[PDB]
């Protein structure tokens, strides 16, 4: 429960999906050749891709329900 | 008729200063010794002369036959400090299920570990009632003992006559009987006052 990203019987789809999006972005920031792949694919500098991922970290999957 | 399935072993020759405990240690080194179901005292016999004199022969029955064949190939022709023993399948010439199953359960492989039995009763008496009545405390102790005897075997029972809350301790042999006594004593009335019970 103290670890961030764990769930329980009341976990919703939104929390699950934002958790996997957030650690996906962190894994992209960590691994050197995944960021290379993305920066070649979208034709940007690697610093720009890193900053874009950090900016996307705040609200991935949009704002929550109700 | 029973050719094999003989769990009795015959120890030919022994030191004439043999005690029963050294012998049952010698025999327990090779497995579990069957115990007489009605009683204690493992089924071990020291054959004796017309007097206290020790003939030097011994009988021992085992729970299983594999322990007999163990004693056959490990005790035969082996020396205790002074003498040379001889081991042979015993010769004979001329309640039940309960304890049988218990001795069997002595070979279990059940899970161990786990957590690894005293009930405290309060608000039962007062020190002010025992100042002008020397026989009320003994009658209250006898009533508490008669109440604790119905739930299980009470091993120790004490009553604090100098405690202002009326503390009493009942220590039984099993924690289930103490839990049953704490469940049957909680909320009950004793002497016009509501007494409480807790575990220890």
């Amino acid at each position: 429960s103290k670890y961030i990203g764990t769930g329980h019987a009341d976990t919703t789809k939104w929390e699950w999906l934002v958790n996997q999006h957030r650690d996906s972005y962190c894994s992209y920031m960590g691994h050197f050749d995944l960021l290379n792949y993305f920066a070649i694919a979208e034709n940007e500098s690697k610093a720009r891709v890193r900053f874009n991922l950090m900016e996307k970290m705040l609200q991935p999957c949009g704002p929550p329900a109700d | 008729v029973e050719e094999d399935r003989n769990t009795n072993v015959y120890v030919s020759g022994l030191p004439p200063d043999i005690t029963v405990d050294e012998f049952i240690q010698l025999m327990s080194k090779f497995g579990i010794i069957m115990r007489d179901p009605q009683t204690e005292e493992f089924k071990v016999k020291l054959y004796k002369d017309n007097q206290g004199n020790l003939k030097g022969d011994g009988l021992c029955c085992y729970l299983k036959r594999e322990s007999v064949e163990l004693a056959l190939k490990l005790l035969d022709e082996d020396e205790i400090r002074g003498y040379k023993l001889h081991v042979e399948v015993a010769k004979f010439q001329l309640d039940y299920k309960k304890k049988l199953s218990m001795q069997q359960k002595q070979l279990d492989w059940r899970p161990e570990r786990r957590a690894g039995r005293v009930v405290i009763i309060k608000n039962m008496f007062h020190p002010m009632d025992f100042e002008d009545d020397p026989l009320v405390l003994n009658e209250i102790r006898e009533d508490l003992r008669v109440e604790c005897s119905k739930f299980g075997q009470i091993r120790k029972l004490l009553l604090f006559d100098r405690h202002p809350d009326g503390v009493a301790s009942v220590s039984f042999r099993d924690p289930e009987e103490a839990d049953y006594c704490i469940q049957t004593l909680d909320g009950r009335w004793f002497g016009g006052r509501q007494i409480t019970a807790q575990a220890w």
């Binding site: 990203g5 769930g7 329980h8 999906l17 329900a65 | 492989w109 059940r110």
Partner: protein, 289 residues
Amino acid sequence: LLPRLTPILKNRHEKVQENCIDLVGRIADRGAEYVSAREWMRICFELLELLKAHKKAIRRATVNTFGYIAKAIGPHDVLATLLNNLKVQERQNRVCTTVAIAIVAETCSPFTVLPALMNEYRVPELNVQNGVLKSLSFLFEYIGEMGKDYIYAVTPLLEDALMDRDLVHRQTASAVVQHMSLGVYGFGCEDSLNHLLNYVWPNVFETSPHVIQAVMGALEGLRVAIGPCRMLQYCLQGLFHPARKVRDVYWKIYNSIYIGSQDALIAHYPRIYNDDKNTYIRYELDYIL
């Protein structure tokens, strides 16, 4: 020297015991052909009780000397005697017998111990099969990497024990699965381990604490030996079940899988489509250079 030496093994001083055991070990290692095998058998059966010593040096020397004596006189007779002793004794002596069987199987290759041990599981009587299962558990835990050649031989026995109604059978089979999984890792034994997971998994709905503890241990061993992708594949359909019991069990298993190897799970998550309100597709992984 040796028949004069064997009564000193029962002395109760620690230095005397350690030095006597070391001396008997050296003698058995180099001068094994000078004393009969019957006396060696008696000495090993006496050493059996020293595996319970409160001191670590006594246990270390006893393990060494037992290995030497077993290497000397041969595995067959000592293994027969150890199985007989495992059948008839109290708990601590049976545990020491299990340790001794594992030692014999490590010094003399487990090929020499496994057939006789599996032949004892054929006895139609409980408390004998459970002893065989405990011995197999400790054997695999003790031999570790050497077990990669013997997983195919014990798989049907573990199947049988996992289909059994007895609870100790399934708990001990789960312990065996865990030790076997952590023993072979990086050696390409995933087929048998997936096969055995197919029999371990139905026990997740068990209320008995010891059984569920052993099942969790086996699952965390298979997480290492088999990989987190398979575990996530086993958890996906239960993560959002309508019943709260299924959800509790599956989220416990999932949290255990998530705390270890959080990074690998990035490559294993299934695709989840966008709804009207929220975006769920990870688009970067769809790029194609």
